[PDB]
Amino acid sequence: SAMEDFVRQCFNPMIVELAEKAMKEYGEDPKIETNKFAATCTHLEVCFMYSDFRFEIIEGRDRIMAWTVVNSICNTTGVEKPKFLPDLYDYKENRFIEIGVTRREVHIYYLEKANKIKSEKTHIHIFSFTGEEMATKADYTLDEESRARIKTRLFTIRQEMASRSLWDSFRQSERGE
Ligand SMILES: O=C1c2c(O)c(=O)ccn2N([C@H]2c3ccccc3SCc3c2ccc(F)c3F)[C@@H]2COCCN12
Ligand SMILES: O=C1c2c(O)c(=O)ccn2N([C@H]2c3ccccc3SCc3c2ccc(F)c3F)[C@@H]2COCCN12
Ligand SMILES: [Mn+2]
Ligand SMILES: [Mn+2]
DSSP states (O other), X not given: OHHHHHHHHHSOHHHHHHHHHHHHHTTOOTTTSHHHHHHHHHHXXXXXXXXXXXXXXXXXXXXXXXXXXXXXXXXXXXXXXXXSOOSEEETTTTEEEEEEEESSOHHHHHHHHHHHHOOTTSEEEEEETTSOEEEGGGXXXXXXXXXXXXXXXXXXXXXXXXXTTOHHHHHHTSSOO
């Protein structure tokens, strides 16, 4: 697959390894669901970048470790345990964060995410590949420079896919029919 080749050339080996592990843990084959493989790598990279600017990283851990970290936070802050695994915890605002990366309009994916979690407590932050974002209460958490770095990386991934004639397939596989 050209998409598997792109993933393994354009993503940090650590990202690729963790995304492969996450897909295996969740019974999906990176070699068949190749766009999903690219999506999980992209989202992981965004989560790491976000956390790197205050934050505990939940994403990128095996499931048992992720819930272990979540439980430890809830025990030491009294924040309520989320029903679904979030991506980060914010020690400044004392709230979990769900990060979404979408090839669709940010408002659509935001509504989908917010409908899934139904827990107002978890903060939602959505990024598109063209510099758009939508966040709970229009509170973007990060400053403008950090969000800019994230947006630039996402756009770069999109243009790399476009250079390789991969973007259209990737864009159409996010939502089913
Ligand atoms: O943590 C996530 C997750 C998100 O954080 C997310 O934003 C969107 C989607 N997620 N999920 C995605 C995921 C993450 C990033 C990009 C696409 C996908 S698509 C389905 C899938 C995920 C992970 C492994 C796998 F094999 C999958 F099929 C699963 C949902 O259940 C808990 C873990 N997780
Ligand atoms: O900036 C960082 C970075 C730190 O600033 C840091 O404190 C710890 C770790 N970092 N790094 C990690 C990183 C940061 C946060 C959470 C997980 C990861 S894991 C691999 C990875 C990083 C960044 C982007 C990326 F695509 C990666 F695959 C890399 C080291 O050098 C260059 C940029 N960078
Ligand atoms: Mn996640
Ligand atoms: Mn997420």
